[PDB]
Design an enzyme around this catalytic site. Structure first.
Site, PDB file in Angstrom:
ATOM      1  N   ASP A 138      -8.780  -4.912  -6.085  1.00 55.09           N
ATOM      2  CA  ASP A 138      -8.095  -3.790  -5.464  1.00 55.09           C
ATOM      3  C   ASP A 138      -7.918  -2.664  -6.477  1.00 55.09           C
ATOM      4  O   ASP A 138      -7.224  -2.816  -7.488  1.00 55.09           O
ATOM      5  CB  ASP A 138      -6.730  -4.211  -4.913  1.00 55.09           C
ATOM      6  CG  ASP A 138      -5.990  -3.057  -4.261  1.00 55.09           C
ATOM      7  OD1 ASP A 138      -6.614  -1.999  -4.006  1.00 55.09           O
ATOM      8  OD2 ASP A 138      -4.799  -3.250  -3.896  1.00 55.09           O
ATOM      9  N   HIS A 149      -7.797  -4.754  -1.392  1.00 52.89           N
ATOM     10  CA  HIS A 149      -6.600  -4.006  -1.043  1.00 52.89           C
ATOM     11  C   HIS A 149      -5.867  -4.629   0.130  1.00 52.89           C
ATOM     12  O   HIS A 149      -4.662  -4.399   0.296  1.00 52.89           O
ATOM     13  CB  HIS A 149      -6.909  -2.535  -0.752  1.00 52.89           C
ATOM     14  CG  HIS A 149      -5.683  -1.690  -0.593  1.00 52.89           C
ATOM     15  ND1 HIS A 149      -4.678  -1.653  -1.541  1.00 52.89           N
ATOM     16  CD2 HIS A 149      -5.262  -0.900   0.423  1.00 52.89           C
ATOM     17  CE1 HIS A 149      -3.719  -0.838  -1.129  1.00 52.89           C
ATOM     18  NE2 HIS A 149      -4.050  -0.355   0.051  1.00 52.89           N
ATOM     19  N   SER A 191       0.850  -1.198   0.000  1.00 51.23           N
ATOM     20  CA  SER A 191       0.000   0.000   0.000  1.00 51.23           C
ATOM     21  C   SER A 191       0.892   1.258   0.000  1.00 51.23           C
ATOM     22  O   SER A 191       1.730   1.388  -0.898  1.00 51.23           O
ATOM     23  CB  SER A 191      -1.024  -0.064   1.135  1.00 51.23           C
ATOM     24  OG  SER A 191      -1.956   1.009   0.993  1.00 51.23           O
TER      25      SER A 191
END
Length: 254
Positions: A184, A237, A128
């Site tokens: 995602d 995600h 991320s």
């Protein structure tokens, strides 16, 4: 994209290490012995530096944000010690700022580890925001340590700069991988023509298994993230290559 099951084990490891960074593992994260804990309060930048005797690597593992639910997308001229950026390179402040806060600390520790383990190669990894940080770490390490082999694995990352930035990343010796997950949308952030940020590296993509793992063609293969119909923080995600962040543990009993 094309089937590339052989890529899965290294990306699965990268996801475990990235999860360890969120967990805040003590002493070690799987095969990596952690020698220095990187922390910037104001930018909430966290990570680890250490070494793997198993892999013969010196590793920089960056944490993502402690919440994914604001980030500064103003493009700026970056400046980092030991790095010579072409004039046209621009990177978003929301990634340059946190990286620049920890850059010198990380480079210093990597240089100390290179002295102790002079046959080890380099790696950088994170998920991320940690993956966005890894996309700058890759260039920081390549530029500061040009005689070392280098592989960087940014997981579930958004792009961080302009085309000149992406070209500069591509120009570095060393392999930059973007490992992404189904469902995602974070890698699709900033792809609109009016914003127009650019990825570099080789994208890989899976739905959590070796069999599903593909190597993507170019930066925006429609069989990988670019085609997945997702935008920003959607359910996929939280996972990468079969690992849900925070659930891997640390490898304490392995």
């Amino acid at each position: 994209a094309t089937a590339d099951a052989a890529a899965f084990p290294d990306l699965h490891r990268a996801a475990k290490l990235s999860s360890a960074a969120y967990t805040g593992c003590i002493g070690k994260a799987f095969d990596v012995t952690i020698v220095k804990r990187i922390y910037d309060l104001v930018t909430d930048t966290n990570g680890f530096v250490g070494y793997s005797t198993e892999k013969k690597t010196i590793a920089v593992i960056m944490r993502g944000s402690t919440t994914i639910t604001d980030i500064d997308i103003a493009l700026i001229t970056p400046e980092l010690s030991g790095v010579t950026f072409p004039s046209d390179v621009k990177i978003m402040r929301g990634v340059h700022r946190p990286w620049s806060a920890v850059h010198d600390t990380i480079i210093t520790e990597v240089k100390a580890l290179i002295a102790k383990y002079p046959d080890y190669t380099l790696e950088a990894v994170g998920h991320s925001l940690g993956g966005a940080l890894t996309s700058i770490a890759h260039v920081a390490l390549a530029q500061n340590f040009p005689d070392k082999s280098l592989v960087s694995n940014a997981l579930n990352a958004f792009p961080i700069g302009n085309q000149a930035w992406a070209d500069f990343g591509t120009a570095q010796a060393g392999t930059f991988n973007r490992g992404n997950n189904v469902l995602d949308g974070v890698p699709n952030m900033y792809s609109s023509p009016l914003v127009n940020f650019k990825h570099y590296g080789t994208e890989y993509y899976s739905s959590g298994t070796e069999a599903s793992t593909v190597k993507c063609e170019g930066q925006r293969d429609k069989s990988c993230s670019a085609g997945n119909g997702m935008y920003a923080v959607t359910p996929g995600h939280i996972a990468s290559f079969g690992v849900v962040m925070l659930t891997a543990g640390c490898g304490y009993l392995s």
